[PDB]
């Protein structure tokens, strides 16, 4: 029985390929077709396709075409020496709010001022002078930000293999693979150190990383309980409407209607115990005979250490130091309320000049909202990092970090890849061609 080569056409062999997926949403409105009214899904069966959420070529497709639509809605610096002082007053301590000098011819809260001093003889009077935080940055443009559940769909000729195994870890094989032409609701909300309005899991809290035994790799933690948060600004600002230029607007809002209550947040301490208690129970598995110590973040730029929000159109920077702040020797221990349970707060600062889109560098201006601001979201994910230190005595310290901006989207695109169908394949058999 001599074998012979035979070519077949219609083989189900797959090949991972890249493409330019198109958006889809209900209602930000350019190039996005409406959602599919018939979201078909076919379970393949006994297939084991090796996934890899870290080497995925879809996260780059989402990181791009989102700075692109962001730039389409932003199509100016005027850095002059300011002059201000402390405001006339869980309480606000120092929040400078004043007006500047000459605009063309003859209120910047706290993280957008840089102190200076002239060379005159006014040093005996203590006359301070400020400057904008992005005075020497490339382009400072000026403009509602509401996340819409964008759906990425595959083009003609390509498919999407969505796994369904509830025990994901990031890489390795899957056992329940199904094909879909689109995806679930993806909220493009930007934030650091915490993932807001994400997607909960189906089993216990799972962690995932490219190499858990490495320190530079981001450790994405997906929860299974929508921990709520209540961040609000109890102040009241009024639109100044300063016009500078031939038909140009600017809004350096501010009013004294009791500027003493500092904007903060509220997190359920009872719910926060059950979350971290299950996380340490999972981290102890990969890290045996060790103490999972949580600690304060790093330093440098103020937009790194703090959490980034978006509440109705204003950005909040909150000190996340009261969060995690413990040692956690064994599983589910080391509590600290002594019978309190009094809503652990987070003091927050508010910026106006935003170093928009981490990686390139092109700031923008956020127009303030007239009145009180109140928002509420669900803390569903967590970004972490491990400090590789030689003083490791069974205490591997973890920090919130924040990592790259792409890590906020790898926690939602970890379930699928884009494949191409190669239809021809060869195989040997016993037939022979007549000649």
């Amino acid at each position: 029985a001599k074998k012979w080569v035979t070519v077949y056409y219609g083989v189900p062999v797959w090949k991972e390929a890249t493409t330019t997926l198109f958006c889809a949403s209900d209602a930000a409105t350019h190039a996005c077709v409406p959602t599919d009214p018939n979201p078909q899904e076919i379970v393949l069966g006994n297939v084991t396709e090796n996934f890899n959420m870290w080497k995925n070529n879809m996260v780059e497709q989402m990181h791009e075409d989102i700075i692109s639509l962001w730039d389409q809605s932003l199509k100016t610096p005027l850095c002059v020496t300011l002059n201000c002082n402390n405001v006339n007053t869980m309480e606000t301590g120092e929040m400078k709010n004043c007006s500047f000098n000459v605009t063309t011819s003859i209120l910047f809260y706290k993280l957008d001022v840089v102190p200076l001093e002239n060379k005159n003889n006014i040093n005996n009077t203590n006359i301070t002078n400020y400057r904008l935080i992005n005075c020497n940055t490339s382009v400072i443009t000026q403009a509602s930000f509401e996340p819409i559940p964008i759906h990425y769909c595959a083009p003609a000729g390509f498919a999407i293999l969505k796994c369904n195994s509830k025990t994901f870890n990031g890489s390795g094989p899957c056992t329940n693979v199904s094909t879909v032409q689109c995806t679930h609701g993806i909220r493009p909300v930007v934030s650091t150190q915490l993932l807001l309005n994400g997607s909960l899991a189906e089993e216990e809290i799972v962690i995932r990383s490219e190499n858990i035994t490495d320190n530079a790799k981001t450790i994405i933690v997906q929860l299974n309980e929508a921990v709520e948060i209540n961040c609000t600004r109890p102040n009241n600002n009024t639109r100044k409407s300063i016009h500078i230029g031939p038909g140009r607007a600017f809004y350096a809002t501010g009013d004294i209607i009791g500027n003493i209550r500092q904007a903060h947040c509220n997190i359920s301490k009872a719910r926060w115990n059950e979350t971290l208690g299950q996380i340490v129970a999972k981290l102890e598995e990969q890290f045996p005979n060790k103490t999972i110590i949580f600690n304060h973040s790093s330093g440098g730029d103020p937009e790194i250490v703090t959490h980034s929000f978006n509440c109705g159109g204003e950005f909040f920077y909150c000190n996340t130091t009261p969060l995690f702040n413990s040692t956690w020797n064994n599983t589910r221990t080391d509590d600290y309320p002594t019978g309190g349970e009094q809503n652990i707060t987070l003091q927050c600062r508010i910026k106006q000049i935003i170093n928009m889109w981490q990686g390139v560098g092109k700031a923008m201006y956020a127009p303030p909202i007239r009145g009180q601001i109140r928002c509420s979201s669900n803390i569903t994910g967590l970004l972490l990092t491990r400090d590789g230190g030689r003083d490791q005595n069974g205490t591997e310290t973890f920090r919130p970090g924040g990592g790259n901006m792409r890590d906020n989207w790898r926690s939602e695109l970890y379930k699928y890849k884009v494949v191409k169908i190669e239809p021809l394949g060869i195989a040997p058999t016993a037939c022979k061609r007549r000649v």
Epitope: A216, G299, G300, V360, G361
Partner: nanobody, 127 residues
């Protein structure tokens, strides 16, 4: 521990492009700002600018406006410094520094005092 290791010496002809590199080891390079200063034998130190590898924010001094460019690699934990033009007066020892941590009770620029330096590389224009 925190340590910055620079590259070796690089003797180049006047009009070339010297590429001085930095390397972060004991911390997360994507969270701190890196400074570059210059030191000539007998002269004083002189600031050359800084780069923010987190958001890509770059700021260089007016003296080196169109002569020195800054580039950084986040995934490799290395900061680079390119030079457009050269001159025999640029024969100096280049450094590399790292800013300090940010505290909750200070201005956004009170923590850029160059905590950790680096083993300074030297460049010669004409030997």
């Amino acid at each position: 521990q925190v340590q910055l290791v620079q590259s070796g010496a690089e003797v180049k002809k006047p009009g070339a492009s010297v590429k001085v590199s930095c390397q972060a080891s004991g911390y997360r390079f994507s969270n701190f700002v890196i400074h570059w200063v210059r030191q000539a034998p007998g002269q004083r130190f002189e600031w050359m600018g800084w780069i923010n590898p987190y958001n890509g924010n770059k700021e260089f001094s007016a003296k080196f406006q169109d002569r020195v460019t800054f580039t950084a690699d986040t995934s490799a934990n290395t900061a680079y410094m390119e030079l457009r033009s050269l001159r025999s007066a640029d024969t100096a020892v280049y450094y590399c520094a790292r800013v300090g941590p940010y505290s909750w009770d200070d201005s956004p620029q009170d923590n850029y005092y160059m905590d950790v330096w680096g083993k300074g590389t030297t460049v010669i224009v004409s030997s």
